[PDB]
Amino acid sequence: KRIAVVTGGMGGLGEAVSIRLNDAGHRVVVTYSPNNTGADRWLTEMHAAGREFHAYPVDVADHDSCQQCIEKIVRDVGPVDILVNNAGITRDMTLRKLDKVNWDAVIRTNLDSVFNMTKPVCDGMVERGWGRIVNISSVNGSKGSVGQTNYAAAKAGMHGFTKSLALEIARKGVTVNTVSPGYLATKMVTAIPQDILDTKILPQIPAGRLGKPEEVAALVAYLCSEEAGFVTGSNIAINGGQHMH
Amino acid sequence: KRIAVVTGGMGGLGEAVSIRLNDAGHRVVVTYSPNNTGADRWLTEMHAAGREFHAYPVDVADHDSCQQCIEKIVRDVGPVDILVNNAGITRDMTLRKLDKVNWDAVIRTNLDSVFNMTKPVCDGMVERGWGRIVNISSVNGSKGSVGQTNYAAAKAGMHGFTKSLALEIARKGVTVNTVSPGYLATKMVTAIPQDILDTKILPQIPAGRLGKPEEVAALVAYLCSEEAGFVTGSNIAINGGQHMH
Amino acid sequence: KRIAVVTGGMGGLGEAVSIRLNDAGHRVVVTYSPNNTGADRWLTEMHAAGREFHAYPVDVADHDSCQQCIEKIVRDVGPVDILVNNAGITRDMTLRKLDKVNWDAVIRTNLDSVFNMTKPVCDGMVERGWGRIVNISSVNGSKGSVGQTNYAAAKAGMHGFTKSLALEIARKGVTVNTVSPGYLATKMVTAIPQDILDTKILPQIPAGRLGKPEEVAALVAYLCSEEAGFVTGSNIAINGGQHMH
Amino acid sequence: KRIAVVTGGMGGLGEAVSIRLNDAGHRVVVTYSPNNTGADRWLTEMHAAGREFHAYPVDVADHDSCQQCIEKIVRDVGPVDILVNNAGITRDMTLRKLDKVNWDAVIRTNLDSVFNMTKPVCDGMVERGWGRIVNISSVNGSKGSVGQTNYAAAKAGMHGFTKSLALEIARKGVTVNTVSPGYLATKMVTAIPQDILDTKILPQIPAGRLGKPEEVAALVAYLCSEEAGFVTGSNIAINGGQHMH
Ligand SMILES: [Cl-]
Ligand SMILES: [Cl-]
Structure with missing residues (x-):
């Protein structure tokens, strides 16, 4: 019944979200950057565990690339009921060392993306009287x-977008x-030297452990559900x- | 497997929560005020739709009454894994007309209750390494x-409790x-003259409708679930x- | 022109506030617990520093005590234009060890006090078309x-009250x-071993120092001013x- | 002693801020868009009222434009101790009708500006151990x-930036x-038909009046003061x- 689009849906948190939405019964479409060569290996790995996805290339920072990609998805798969804006990068640098290039890369990829994809x-969602949009902050x-004047500006901006829309x-x-996750067990966080995890990161978390991407995916699935219509x-x-x- | 206690669980939002938790697979125990004569009619109505509950009388405003009630529940049913502090009243009056009696009734019933029940x-939850406590604000x-200096003080206080615990x-x-619900379709809200609903209440709600108690119950059930352990x-x-x- | 009441006004943050408001041109009245025997000492000190105050015994936890104190202040000094609810205590204990006595002491002194004094x-404030109430959280x-399920509940409750009123x-x-202060250089905090200040307190504060009570008092003075009428x-x-x- | 820069300083809220900081004893520099031909008029008016300002053309959306403007201000006036990021625009349109041009205009002018100017x-501020940055949201x-997915995104983004920096x-x-102002009595708002002010604007404001730009400027002055060092x-x-x- 519902068709869901998950940007950056083929890796890290993205992937957990796509898998969970699939298992909830949605038809899931993922997007990936043109630079990512793994979409065929990923779709086969996913088919092997028995999940059918589609996958489209897009540059979420570019308006026309997104309009095009969404047109193709609607042509090939059907109208978008659910969108999870998950694509996003970091370019961490204190403000004193941060240059315009890396300010821009983060704002354009992480916040312009929200406008461009949404x-x-x-x-269509308005015309059918049903939609779910989830912005991953x-x-x-x-x-x-x-080191995150750029990243926190983009991610806080995303919630300003959420409210107005x-x-x-x-x-x-x-x-x-x-949805605003804390520290998750994904490739970027899990590569941190063990002593830094134990003496710097984990002490900041009352739960005393990293979050799982599947946990965040479960929350996204709740928000995309039929009975979450009064949460906005x-x-x-x-x-x-x-x-x- | 899990045993859940829902205060004020036999009516309004309480009841929706108890039903949903039951349908999620939990063993549900409700509490009711000693003044409420309907616990036998309610348990029969619930048995008729095929749900098995237990029900205990308590005064959530009284510390010893709560310790006793919880002892009985642990004796008769078993250890408490989940608690939803849902009991609560209103005594709406502007501060200029509000007397100490009605200030107290609200603070004691709505905020002292959180200490007394929790x-x-x-x-036990700490000793077993698993628990879920949901405070309904x-x-x-x-x-x-x-008109709610008393009610908003109590309900905001509840979230201060949440954070520290x-x-x-x-x-x-x-x-x-x-969990902080807005306007719900329950007996207190649904009795408002239709014109006030249409020209005063609904215009405050972007969704353009009242919430259902079942919707809030679905959110409580998500928080009590096994995969919501990183939300606290x-x-x-x-x-x-x-x-x- | 303006007459200000500062509960807990003879010590700590309350003192700094009373001093600042005096120096801003207000006539300042303080309150203290009837079992505090320091009023003559504090007045003497203040007088030698050139400030004139009135000080009245009150139990802020008791509604009639507060009502009678204010009536006396209105008879002997004049109508109250400014109230700063600064009085409050701590009784820190984890919930597992916290008893009803110590829950209650903090709820009644810290939260019921806002209702009792306000x-x-x-x-009066409404009849004259001007007033300033500042609640210190x-x-x-x-x-x-x-250790502060009681204190956080009371202090979060205070802000619930603020909004509704x-x-x-x-x-x-x-x-x-x-107003929500962080760590302040009061007698209590400055008596924490230097060692605990350096390894436990100061690392929680990006500024790298304790706040001064004078600094918080400057903010209260700002809120009590004629030009802060649009902040509410x-x-x-x-x-x-x-x-x- | 202190040298203050107020972007958008010649009109509206920016004006009130520039005036207030001047009157607080600061040396105030304003910026304006190079296509604004009102600088001589504004300086003349200010001079006749006894205030001396410097005004510099800048495009706050352009990183090099801002860098060169500040270098000029440091050469001709001196090191900047106080920056108020007040410049910003609106391009209101619902998302369904909002085009990329108008998303971008607001993100670049309102959000990129904080990075460009700050x-x-x-x-300098860090080397001397004293500074005040105020971002007007x-x-x-x-x-x-x-109609403000763009404006809310930029203004929420600004506060993301505030926190990280x-x-x-x-x-x-x-x-x-x-600083987050509500409705202010600027030329734009006071030119809303009296009718729309009474039925549409004022009912949103419990105070029952528009804010004065002077009142917001008093708050900025408070934050820029020597005694506001613990507010960050x-x-x-x-x-x-x-x-x-
Ligand atoms: Cl005292
Ligand atoms: Cl301009």
Whole structure:
């Protein structure tokens, strides 16, 4: 019944989300950067565990690339009911060392992406009277973080987008929500030297452990569900207690 | 497998929560005020739709009454894995007309209740390394509301409790979360003259409709689930967009 | 012109506030617990420093005690234009060890006090079309703290109260705001071993120092000023960057 | 002693800020868009009112434009101690109708500007151990607004930036804070038909009036003061009670 698009859906958190949405019964489409050569290996690996996906290349930072990609998906698969804006990078540098190139890379990939991917899907969801849009932020959007003037600006901006869009289209049966994960067990975090995990990262987390990508995926699946229609404009923290407010 | 206690579990939101938790597979125990004569009619109605509950009388405002009630439940049913602090009243009056009697009734029933019900269950959850505590607040805790200096103080206080407890026991596998519903279709809200619903209440809600108690129950069930262990110290808004922050 | 009441005004943060408001041109009245035998000492000290204050015994936990104190202040000094609810205590214990006595002491002194002290002064403020109420909270109300389910509940509750009352009387030229301080250099904190200050306290504060009570008092003075009339229902953090949201 | 830069300083809120900081004893420099031909008129007016300012053309959306402007200000006037990022625009359109041009105009002018203007002044502030950065947001960043997915994204983004930068430099005596105004009596708003003010704007504001630009400027002056050094990473609401959280 529902068709879901997950940007950056073939790796890390993206992948957990795509798998969970698939297992919830949705038809899942993922997007990947043109530079990523693994979409055929990934679709075969996924077919081997018995999950059928589609996959499209896009540059989420480029408006026309996104309009095109979404047109193809609607042609080939069908109308988008669910969108998870998960694509995003970091270019961590203190403000004193941060240059315009790396400011821009983060704002364009992480926040412009939200406009570029969301605009082409909304009119259909409004026209059918049902939609779910989930913007994947970060605890560092809420809290701030050293070396992340760019990343926290983009991720906090994403929730400003969430709120305004939510107000525009709530009455038509479309929800818009932000999810802000803390530290997860993914390739970037798990490569940290063990002593830094144990003496720097884990002490910041009351739960005393990393989050699993599958846990965050379960929350995204709840928000995309039929009975989550009264939750809109929210920012849901899934962070082990690392930050509360 | 899990045993859940829902205060005020036999009516309004309480009941939706108890039903949903039952249908999720939990063994559900409800509490009711000694003044409520309907526990036998309710348990029969519930048995008729095929749900097995237990029900205990308690005064959530009284510490010893709660310790006793929880002892009986542990004796008769077994150890408490899940607690939903849902009991709560309103005594709405502007501060200028509000007297100490009605200030107290709300603070004692709505906030002291959280201490009184939660304290006797925590040591077991910590000892087994698993627990879920869900505190049911209100959008008026976040936003404030005219005539609710007492109610918003109690409901905002509940989330202060949530945060501190969450920090104390996160490392032992126990989560503590607040849920803040907006306007729901329950007997108090549905009795409002139709014109007031249409010209005063609904215009405050971007979704353009009341929430269902079952919707809030679905969110509580998500928080009590096995895969919601990385969400703790949160306050999740389920309000149709009525308030965002 | 303005007459200000500062509960707990003879010591710690309350002192700094009383001093600052005096020096801003207000006539300052303080309250103290009837079992505090330091009033003559504090007045003598203040007089030798050139400041004139009135000091009245009150039990802020007791509604009639507060009502009678304010009536006396209105007879002997004049109508109250400014109230700063600064009185409050701690009784820190984890929930597993916290007894009802110590839950209650903190809820009644810290939260019931806002109702007890604020109710007898609001009508006047409203009738004259001008007033300032400032509720002194804590960073621990925003973030929670181990050992402070009682304190965080009371201090978060205070801000619930702030919001609801602000909505009730904003139209009449009365403002109500919360101030949430972090770690301050009061006698209590500056008596923490230097060692614990360096390894446990200061690392929580990006500013790398304790706040001065004078600095918090400058903020209260700002909120009590004639030009702060458009700030209402807010919770202003003054914590050296210890918590942000 | 202190040298202050106020972007957008010749009109509206920026004007009130520039005036207030001047009157607080600071040496105030303003910036304006190079296509604004009003600088001589504004200086003449200010001079006749007894205030002396310097005004420099800048494109806040352009990184090199801002870097060269600050270098000129440092040569002709002196090192910048205070920066108020007040410049910003609106291009209101619902997402369904919003084009990339108008997304971009607002992200670049409102959000990239904080990076462009703040980066060239931070090192100085850090080297001397004193600085104040104030980012002017909006109530619509906190709450979202119909037609403002772009504006809310930029203004919420600004506060993301505030938090991360505050964490980076708090240890060096530099503060970074956001101020979020509600409806203000600027030329634009006071030109809304009286009719729309009464039925559409004022009912959103518990205070029952528009804010004065002077009132917001008094808050900025407070944050820029010597005694506000322990306030950092905050977002202070000045909205007549329009939004609370
Ligand atoms: Cl005392
Ligand atoms: Cl300009």
